[PDB]
């Protein structure tokens, strides 16, 4: 008949977070499952109307329909300030190719409305490429684009256990590309990997290897919009670093240019981690299903492939991917009666100027 879901959390990257939704499995004798979901945190307020048939065809191919609104405040995400009020629709066909893999192709539309953009080099460079000529001295700028996209997704998940795996792998690869007629013209791809290799019969000692990769760029003069950039740093990418701090920093124009510590992301990104999961001290091995200890080496880099270091010779070369950030630490996780609790302590041993260290990082509930 339906379902109401409510979730709450606190994280050092996104502050307090809410998750709420309601669904009807056969809304007014239509056969499709209509739903409404929301999300709020320090920097984003999302909402959407969904309508999904779980068995569109007998083969198992589904047809999902989405209608959304989204508000994003960049300074509340540790980035150079901007505001993106976006809204749109997405249609997606889901193909369960087998019990471990699933694919998904879809079409989309997104209206993006930028505002409150302090004049900075990487952001203005993109605005110039789009035909805008904003003032290099006025804090009050706006920009609107209407894009159409083809979206692709692949999810592989051959893990033994959903929460606290000891063996197997998970891969997620998403892609998207603008369709002609769109204001922007770019592609964007992301790759996420997780591999658990147990080093003992009882699976109490497990080596976990993770990677995250991102690459996006323009097609025909236009650059990828800065609102679609990649980021690294935070408890979910490179522990020990403040959320999104890694990579290029805003070079502001005078209100000669100011170099800064405010992160701006980039169109390229790479993150690798090696984690050794162990039995928890002072706790029994019967609780490894709900408590987990681990030691890790995290590292990542984010770069701007269009940063022209020839004309910005004094400032750092942000098109250089060789500035590999690194950290080492210990993590503790507990599936508590309040949901998943994760506490980590990492000391960044290799950091570039601008990078902000956040040694203690903690997450409880949904994030």
């Amino acid at each position: 008949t339906g379902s109401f879901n409510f979730g709450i959390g606190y994280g050092t990257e996104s502050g307090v977070s809410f998750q709420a939704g309601v669904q009807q499995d056969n809304w007014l004798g239509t056969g499709y499952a209509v739903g409404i979901n929301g999300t709020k945190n320090d920097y984003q307020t999302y909402a959407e109307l969904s309508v999904t048939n779980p068995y569109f065809t007998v083969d198992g191919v589904s047809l999902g329909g989405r209608l959304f609104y989204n508000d994003f405040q960049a300074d509340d995400a540790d980035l150079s300030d901007y505001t993106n009020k976006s809204y749109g629709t997405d249609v997606t066909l889901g193909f369960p190719i087998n019990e471990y893999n699933s694919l998904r192709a879809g079409l989309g539309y997104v209206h993006n409305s930028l505002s409150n953009m302090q004049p900075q080099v990487a952001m203005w460079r993109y605005l110039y490429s789009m035909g805008e000529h904003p003032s290099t001295s006025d804090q009050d700028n706006s920009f609107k684009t209407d894009d159409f996209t083809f979206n692709y997704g692949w999810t592989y998940n051959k893990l033994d256990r959903g929460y606290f795996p000891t063996d197997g792998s998970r891969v997620n690869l998403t892609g998207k590309v603008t369709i002609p007629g769109s204001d922007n013209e770019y592609y964007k791809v992301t790759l996420d990997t997780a591999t658990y290799v147990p080093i003992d019969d009882d699976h109490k000692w497990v080596v976990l290897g993770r990677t995250r990769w991102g690459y996006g760029d323009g097609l025909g003069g236009k650059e990828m919009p800065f609102y679609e950039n990649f980021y690294a740093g935070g408890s979910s990418t490179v522990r020990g670093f403040q959320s999104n701090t890694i990579g290029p920093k805003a070079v502001y124009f005078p209100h000669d240019l100011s170099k800064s510590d405010d992160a701006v992301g980039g169109n390229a990104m790479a993150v690798a981690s090696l984690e050794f999961i162990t039995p928890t001290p002072f706790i029994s091995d019967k609780y490894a299903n709900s408590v987990r200890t681990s030691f890790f080496w995290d590292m990542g880099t984010v770069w701007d492939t269009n940063w022209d270091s020839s004309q910005y010779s004094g400032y750092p070369d942000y098109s250089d991917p060789s500035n590999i950030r690194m950290s080492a630490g210990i993590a503790l996780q507990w599936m508590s009666p309040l949901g998943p609790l994760v506490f980590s302590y990492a000391q960044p041993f290799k950091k570039y100027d601008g990078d902000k260290a956040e040694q203690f990082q903690f997450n409880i509930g949904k994030t």
């Binding site: 109401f4 879901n5 709450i8 998750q19 929460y163 309040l338």
Partner: peptide
Amino acid sequence: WNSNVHSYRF
């Protein structure tokens, strides 16, 4: 992970 306060189906 999701709906840690209430995952209610009816």
